[PDB]
Design a binder for this molecule. Structure first.
Ligand code: NAG
Ligand code: NAG
Ligand code: CA
Length: 189
């Protein structure tokens, strides 16, 4: 089972969309169709500028504000019981940008409770809102021991206009030292 994905292949290292959401994340190469209007990446993080590498993104043209898209990792087996990390890169460029949330879902926990307002703070690894500029940022999140198998859930929320494309790339789970390193140089909480 792969613990990292650069999204270069169409099978996405076993990541799959949520069976009940508003729309799918898309895999794409370079520029988003709405790019000319100051939104979305111009290239992925793996191969960078001039590069032709692939990222995942929400197409926000023709969707409604606060509609959500979810991308789910394969199911992992207590690889969090170490010093577990989730590390990923994201691109949030666009006026009227929506939001990006990253949850850790224990397998037993149904997606309904996971997302509910009542209980989602216990599971949020990452939450960001608004325009962040034309640039790839990164995040590293400590992962809690839930004594269960689990999934990583990346949820994009469309903003108030079609200029709210969000992209992810280069996702990763790591353990131990690699975590303390990551925390030394990745933005974290
Ligand atoms: C959309 O969600 C954000 C935060 O959850 C909230 O501030 C905003 O008012 C919501 N707008 C609508 C129209 O649902
Ligand atoms: C940290 O990363 C290196 C290179 O990928 C690898 O050799 C090492 O096994 C990793 N450490 C742990 C504790 O997984
Ligand atoms: Ca990539």
């Amino acid at each position: 089972d792969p613990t990292e994905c650069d999204f270069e292949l169409p099978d996405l290292c076993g990541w799959k969309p949520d069976e009940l959401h508003d729309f799918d994340w898309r895999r794409l190469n370079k520029k988003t169709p709405s790019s000319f209007l100051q939104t979305g990446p111009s290239y992925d993080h793996t191969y960078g500028k001039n590069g032709s590498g692939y990222y995942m993104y929400i197409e926000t043209t023709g969707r409604t504000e606060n509609e959500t898209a979810r991308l789910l990792s394969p199911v992992y087996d207590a690889e969090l019981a170490k010093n577990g990390c989730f590390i990923f890169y994201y691109h949030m460029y666009g006026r009227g940008m929506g939001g990006l949330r990253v949850y850790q879902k224990p397998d037993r926990v149904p997606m309904y409770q996971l997302l509910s307002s009542s209980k989602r703070n216990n599971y949020l690894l990452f939450e960001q809102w608004g325009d962040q500029g034309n640039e790839w940022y990164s995040s590293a999140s400590m992962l809690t021991d839930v004594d269960d198998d689990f999934q990583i859930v990346i949820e994009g929320i469309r903003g108030n206009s079609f200029m709210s494309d969000i992209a992810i790339d280069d996702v990763s789970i790591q353990r131990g030292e690699n975590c303390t390193k990551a925390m030394l140089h990745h933005h974290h909480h």
